[PDB]
């Protein structure tokens, strides 16, 4: 909710301050393995995991909208961080799938 807080409040004050916000901030996460993939052998077959941490900056874009710009930049963290939880459980889901099915089998 605190990610979106600023996002949704920077849409009709953005679409011409889109340019500004993306400039001061740390440039895009790599599309080829921007995330940190980890391999791990465990029962319930060899399932790979991963954690979503990458650079994106925070409270450091110069110029632009007084409050919103900086608050939107900071918000990128609340994607990253938050995403790690789902990053481990949805991969854990696929592991515990294997077990459950072989068990009842």
């Amino acid at each position: 909710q605190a990610a979106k807080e600023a996002y949704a409040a920077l849409l009709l004050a953005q679409a011409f301050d889109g340019p500004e916000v993306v400039a001061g901030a740390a440039l895009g996460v790599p599309p080829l393995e921007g995330v940190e993939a980890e391999v791990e052998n465990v029962w319930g077959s060899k399932v790979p995991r991963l954690k979503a941490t990458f650079p994106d900056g925070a409270l450091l874009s110069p110029v632009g909208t007084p409050a919103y710009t900086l608050e939107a930049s900071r918000a990128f963290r609340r994607y990253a961080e938050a995403l790690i939880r789902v990053a481990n459980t949805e991969t854990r889901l696929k592991k515990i799938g294997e077990e459950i099915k072989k068990t009842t089998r």
Partner: protein
């Protein structure tokens, strides 16, 4: 990356530090979703709960296995939403683990 979300909320994930290629183009975002994961030239692909694919089999059969995840739940809008706690808990119990 790409986050696959509503047009207006997709907007805020295209900002630097993050890389999004969202927007709705269907009710489960099939139009986009499929084409995009087919290459798997994005570090992460994520599908929200304001779309979420009712046939997950459709995706798996096309991407043909993936060592990177897909369809991570993000809310997809803000309206004070936090029903994605208990919803995800039951999402789990229905398809796997114990019943009710």
């Amino acid at each position: 990356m790409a986050v696959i979300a509503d047009p207006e909320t997709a907007q805020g994930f295209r900002l630097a530090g993050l890389e999004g290629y969202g927007a709705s183009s269907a009710e489960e975002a099939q139009s986009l979703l499929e084409t995009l994961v087919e290459r798997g030239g994005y570090a992460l692909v994520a599908v929200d709960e304001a779309l979420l694919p009712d046939p997950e089999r459709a995706v798996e059969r096309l991407m043909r296995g993936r060592d990177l995840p897909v369809l991570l739940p993000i809310a997809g809008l803000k309206e004070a939403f936090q029903g994605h706690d208990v919803e995800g808990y039951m999402r789990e119990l229905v398809r796997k683990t114990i019943g009710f």
